[PDB]
Design a protein around this ligand. Sequence first.
Ligand code: MYA
Ligand code: 5PE
Length: 402
Amino acid sequence: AHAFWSTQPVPQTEDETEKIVFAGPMDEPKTVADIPEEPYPIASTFEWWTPNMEAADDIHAIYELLRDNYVEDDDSMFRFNYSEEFLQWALCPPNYIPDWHVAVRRKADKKLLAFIAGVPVTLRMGTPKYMKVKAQEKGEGEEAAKYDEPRHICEINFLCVHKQLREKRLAPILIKEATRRVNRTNVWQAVYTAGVLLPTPYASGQYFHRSLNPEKLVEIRFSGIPMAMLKRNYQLPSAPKNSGLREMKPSDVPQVRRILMNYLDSFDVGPVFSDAEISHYLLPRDGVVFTYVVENDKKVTDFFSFYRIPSTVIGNSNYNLLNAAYVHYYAATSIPLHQLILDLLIVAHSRGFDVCNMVEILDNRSFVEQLKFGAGDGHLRYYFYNWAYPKIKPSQVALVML
Ligand SMILES: CCCCCCCCCCCCCC(=O)SCCNC(=O)CCNC(=O)[C@H](O)C(C)(C)COP(=O)(O)OP(=O)(O)OC[C@H]1O[C@@H](n2cnc3c(N)ncnc32)[C@H](O)[C@@H]1OP(=O)(O)O
Ligand SMILES: COc1cc([C@H]2SCC(=O)N2Cc2ccccn2)ccc1O
């Protein structure tokens, strides 16, 4: 059984979620007034802390916790090493809610012991297309469309319990207190992803990896194999191919918004961004996010973005860090996607990245073979809290998780 997740308003089995035909809430309907104003009880040796994620020193403390105690691969060879500048960026988008950033500290020495963050996101999460077709067949269109409006919900990430406190049931308490703070803000859904299987994902996709520095990837034992031929296989132009590719600037915001919103529209689950959220999530930030538009005749017709997450290489001597670029949002209207993403690779490689990672969401599958991405061991499972949702393919997901 799941002593925690069984008590939660999520579908409980694969079986249950094959049964779901309409999008909609699961729990009893509640009001802010129904929600306790006191934080969830925790042991007297601990205290709740709300870090200030725009304070360098508080960001550094979260940083160290995640550097030492966040997500590893199944073989404990790699561990995410999210940068401080990246943490500020991911956790402080426009209209972020400081109270959604939730820590536990040892009351004695203020040692940071645990963390979970929520940020606001406006998400389209109405009944998916294949199920609206069935609803129409059965004269149930209105029930199917009832929750079509884009919803203001919580996106959770960065759940982390210090290694020294593992399997002590501290993660359920963090999730309950996060849930409480979010509910007190009159928000009743969340979206989150995990590499592990929990009850119960609405979508799952494989990760894909494109080697940019195979010598290094082999050396750290991420890849296997002659090195001259492997280098030759993965070699890339030294400069981008699309004439008038350039980094995004602030005046591109409205057109990038337009073409992104038009594109993400075609997917069942996807975010809606204001101009302020496009500027936050897509304007270039050194070491963090990198975004390039195609502009021809003073008009932005395509773009791509990727973000950086270095990983600690745990076992190797010769290297302590892996530099990885993650495919972020993009849109193509003037060139095949593979031609657009080729430039992403050239740019990533030119800037010193070792590998380009993505999950098979969006139309990421459409360029896998031609650009030489290979399937990895990772899977990313997508979940909602308090939201019934029919199983969809990952190529119907348009929400990139950081
Ligand atoms: C309305 C708004 C709602 C807001 C909240 C929305 C929900 C958000 C949900 C969180 C979204 C997070 C998205 C990400 O950030 S996914 C990345 C999570 N982080 C890591 O994997 C870092 C390395 N690992 C750790 O820090 C710990 O092992 C964690 C903290 C993950 C578990 O700590 P620990 O190992 O010390 O265990 P425990 O004894 O305290 O707790 C055991 C219980 O925890 C359940 N568990 C294990 N892994 C996960 C997991 N990734 N999501 C949710 N639950 C998980 C597990 O099944 C068990 O419950 P049950 O099986 O007994 O029933
Ligand atoms: C080792 O395989 C994977 C690792 C990961 C995550 S787990 C901790 C981490 O640092 N990963 C990122 C990573 C590590 C090595 C190569 C590419 N991506 C995601 C997808 C994968 O296929």
